[PDB]
Amino acid sequence: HMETKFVQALFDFNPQESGELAFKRGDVITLINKDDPNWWEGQLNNRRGIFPSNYVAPYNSN
């Protein structure tokens, strides 16, 4: 009973390692899931990755 949720980042993230998504400030990130209340997976309009959701804020959400 869930769907995709667009969020807006509030800090640049340059993950050199694999697994973490690459996002910028105020960058729209399509939430892929929320396995952990701390780390949320998202797709930067293409590239997927995991990162602390605390570095963003729901935009398209309610």
Taking the C-alpha atoms of residue 1 and residue 13, their distance in angstroms, rounded to an integer, is 30
Are 45 and 30 in contact by the 8 Å Cβ rule? The answer is yes
- Tokens read off for 10: 């509030």
* Residue 5 φ/ψ, nearest 5 degrees: -135, 120
Domains in the chain: boundaries: 1-62
Are 24 and 51 in contact by the 8 Å Cβ rule? The answer is no
Please list, in sequence order, all residues whose beta carbon lies within 8 angstroms of the beta carbon of residue 7, skipping any fewer than 6 positions away: 28, 29, 31, 40, 42, 53, 56, 57, 58, 59, 60, 61
HSE of 7, CA atoms in CB hemisphere, 13 A: 24
Is 1-62 assigned to CATH 3.90.1560.10?
A: no
Are 13 and 23 in contact by the 8 Å Cβ rule? The answer is yes
Relative to beta strand 47-52, strand 39-44 is antiparallel
